[model samples]
Target chain A: GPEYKVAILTVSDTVSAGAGPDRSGPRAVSVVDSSSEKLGGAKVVATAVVPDEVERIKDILQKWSDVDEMDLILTLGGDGFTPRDVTPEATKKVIERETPGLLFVMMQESLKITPFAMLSRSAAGIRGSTLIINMPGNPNAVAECMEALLPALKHALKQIK
Target chain B: GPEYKVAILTVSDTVSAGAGPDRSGPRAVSVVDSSSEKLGGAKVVATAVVPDEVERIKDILQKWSDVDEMDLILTLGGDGFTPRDVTPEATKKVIERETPGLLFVMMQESLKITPFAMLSRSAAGIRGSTLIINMPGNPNAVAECMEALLPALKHALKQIK
Candidate 1:
C-alpha cells in the first residue's frame, strides 16, 4: 500500500508562547510514523506549533491542505470546554464538508477508555483532497484517537483521492 | 423535574411537499413525549415539516430556537450522505456551540446496533437556551438516538438554562 502524507499542527497557548513545551505534536508525529501496520504506510511530512488563536490555526491548516497538499492534517489541542478552545471552530471554518463517521468512530473507541471522551469537542472534515481531524492536546489522546481512526484511514484516503 | 419544551422538525422534500407522510417527525415526538422517565420530563410543544433545503431548515430552526424558545429542538432527516442532506449544516449555522459529547454518546450506542451508523452525519449543539439535535430520517433511528441521549437530557438542558 502507498504511504499517506500527513501533517501535525499543535494548537496551544502555553506551548506557542514558550511557557511550556509541545508534547502532543511530537507524540502525534510518532504515532503516525510508527503505526505503519495500522495506518497502512503513513509518514508525517510536516509539523508546526501555533497559539490558540483561530486565525493562526486556520492559516496553517489552509496552507498544509492546499499548498503542501498533505493527505491528512491532524490538529492537536483547543477543542475543549474552555472559552479559549477554538481549534474545532477554526477547523469547521476551513473544511468544505464534515466526516462525522470518522469522528463517531474516534469518539466511540476513546469513550471506552475514559468517560471524559464525552467532553471532547473534536471534529473531522475534508478540505479539497486533505482530511483534517481535530484532536485533543493530550499526548495519550493523540495515540488513542489515532488508533480509533486507523481502521478507516486507508479507505477514507482512497475515497478522497 | 421540570418538563423541557421540545419541537420536532422533519426535513424531507417528499414529506414537506406532501408526496409522502412525515413518519419520522411523529415518531420523534412520540419518543420525546413518551420517554418521560428517561428524559426527566419533556414535551413536544411544536412540530413542522420542511424540505431538505438549508435556508428553509435554518429559518424554522432559528424561529423555534430564538422566537419560540424551545428547550430542545430535534430535527429528523437531512443528515445523510446524499446531496440534499443539509440539516446538519443548517443546524451548525444556527448553533452557537457544538455539543460533540451528546453526539458521541448517540453515535456510540447506535453503532453497536448497526455499522451503518458510521455513515450518519448527525450533529447536536446549543443555540441560545435551546439545544438542536440532527437525527436521521429513519423512524427507528429517532427512537434509538433519543434513547442514547436521554440520560444526559435533563442535565444538558439545565446547563443551557
Candidate 2:
C-alpha cells in the first residue's frame, strides 16, 4: 500500500470569477489532508479552480493525468442539478474506468442527511492512473461526502492500478 | 424554438472490427428516428460509426454542434466500466449543460428490465445547442432504455433551448 496523494479540483463559474464563496474548495483540501494523517499519510499535491465549462475542466484533468502527478483528483462544486453543473460530465470525459459503487455509496450516504442529495450528479472514476471523484460545492457537503468515500479510496486505487 | 435533428453515433472497436453485431447501433437509430417522428417531424438525420476514442467522439459532436445543422446528437456505446468507454468524458468536454434526469430515467427504466442495466454508464445533457445522450450498445437494452425517454425528449429539448 502506497501513500495516497490527492489533488483538489473545484469547478464553478462563480468561484472562478471570485464572486462565489470558495468554502468547498478549501474544505476539500482540509478533509483530505486530515484523512491522510490518519490513513498512512495521504497528501494533497495540487489544487485548481475552473469555470463550469466542460472544455476547461477537461483541460485541467488532462494535465493532471497526462503528467501522472496526482493519484486522486477530488472535484468540488458543479455537481448539482443546475444548468451549469458539469463536473460529472467532465469526470466522465477523462476517466478510463468508473468506480460506480464508490459514487453510489457517497450519494447514498449523503441522502441520509438530506433529500437534496438526490440532486447531486457527482461522479467518480479513474482516468489513466488518477482517480477522479466529483463532490458537491457546499463546504459541509464536501467534507461529509469525502469522508464517506475515504474508506474505499485507497483500495479502489490499488484495484484499478 | 427551432426543430433539432439528432444523429446516432456508435463507438465500439468490436463493431468497427465487424466482429460484434451492431444491433445496438441500428436499434439506437430506430429508437431516435421513431421518437423524432412522434415529435411531429423532428428528424434523426444522420448516423455515423467510430472507434472508442475521446478525440474522435469530440470531433464528431463538435462538428454537429458547431455546424448549427443538428440540434441534438445521441451517441450509442462507449459508456461503461471499461477502460476505453469515453463517451461521457468526450461529451462532457464539449457540452454546456449536463442533464442527469434524462439519463437517470433511462437507467431507472433499464434496471427495471435487467439488473445488468446498472452497469451502463450512459449519460445525457446539452452541449451548446445540441442535446447529447449516450446509450449502451446493446440493441434490446437501447430500445428499452430509449423508449422510456421518448415522452420527455421534446419538452426537455424545448426547455434547454
Candidate 3:
C-alpha cells in the first residue's frame, strides 16, 4: 500500500561476516516506517548486508536502483573515518547526480546533538529514478540523520520520480 | 612569508571566454590574504580561469596540487543546479579522499545567511597533500564560505601534510 519502494544496504565488515548485528539497518527501516507519511509513503522492499568493500556496496545499490527499481535506498555503515570506510565514495560511483543539500541538512542538524557528527562522510544523490543516501554506522546516528533527512525525502523523491 | 601556498581557480564559461570579469577569484584571493593567520598563514601563489568543462576544471586542480604543490586550492563557480555545473564531479575525480566535514561546515554557516545556500553543490577533498574546495560562483558566497572554512583549514592542512 506504500507509494515508494525502499531498500536498505548494511555495509560493515563485522556485520556482513555475521560477527556483529546490523543495528543501523533496522534503525533506518524503523525510522522510514514511522515517518511513512512524511516520506510520501515508503515501504522497505529489499535489504542486504555487505562488507566494507566498494564493489560489494555498489552491487546492491545498482541492482536495487536498476533491477528492482527501488525509489529510495538507505545505506548504513562505512561512512566513518576508518580505513575501511568508503560508503560515500561507493555512493558517488553509483549515483548519476549529487544532492548535497540533503547531506548538509542532516549534518547540520546532527551537529547540534553531538560534535562527533562532523566525522560523518554521508553522501546522497540520484541514481536513475532512485535516491540513494549514506548513513553513519551507529544505530543512534542513523536515527538522528534519518529524522533530519525526513523533511526533504518526500519532495526529493517526488522530483526524482 | 606565508606558511601555506594557495591557488584559486575561477570556473565559468563566460569568464574563461573573456566575456566576463573574474570577480570570484579576486575575492577568494582577498579573503585568503586577509585571513592568513587563521588559515595558518596562506598566500595565493597561482590563479587561473577555466570553463565549466569537467576536464578543464580537473586539469588545473590536479596540476595545482601535484605540480605546483599548492597547500590549498579554492575553486569558484560551477557548483549549482545547472547542467554545466560539474565542478563537484570534477573535484571528486581528482581527489584521493573526501573531506566532507569542510563542505558541511561551510554550508552550515552559509545557511544562516541565506537559505539559498542549500543550492550550492560544493565539494572538498584532498588531492595528494593539497586540499581542494569548491565555492559558489557568487563573489559574496565565496567570501562567506571562505570565512566559514578558515577555522578548519589550518588543522586540515596539517593532517594532509
Give the number of the best model, judged by DockQ: 1
Error of 3 at A51 (Å): 1.0
**In order, what lDDT does every prediction score?**
0.85, 0.76, 0.85
TM-score of chain A of 3: 0.96
Q: Quick one: RMSD of model 2?
A: 8.9
Per residue, candidate 2 scores C-alpha lDDT tens digits across A3-76 of 77678888888889999677777777778777875545678877999999999999988898878557788888
Query: Cα RMSD to native, each candidate?
Result: 6.3, 8.9, 6.3
Cα lDDT tens digits, model 3, B1-161, are 56889998999999999997788888888888888888777889889999999999998898888888898888899999999999999998998768788777887789899899899999888777788889998889877887776655676666556
Q: Candidate 3: list runs displaced more than 4 Å.
A: B1-93, B107-123, B127-161
Cα lDDT, model 2, residue A70: 75
Better of 1 and 3 by DockQ: 1
Estimate, for each residue in B1-161, the C-alpha lDDT of model 2 and write its tens digit. Answer: 32667788889988877787677767776776666655545766788888898999899999988885577777888886666777877887888878878866776677557444545666667766778888877788767866887787777777766
Q: What is the interface RMSD of candidate 1, in Å?
A: 3.6
**1 versus 2: better DockQ goes to:** 1
For all predicted structures, in order, the TM-scores are: 0.61, 0.57, 0.61
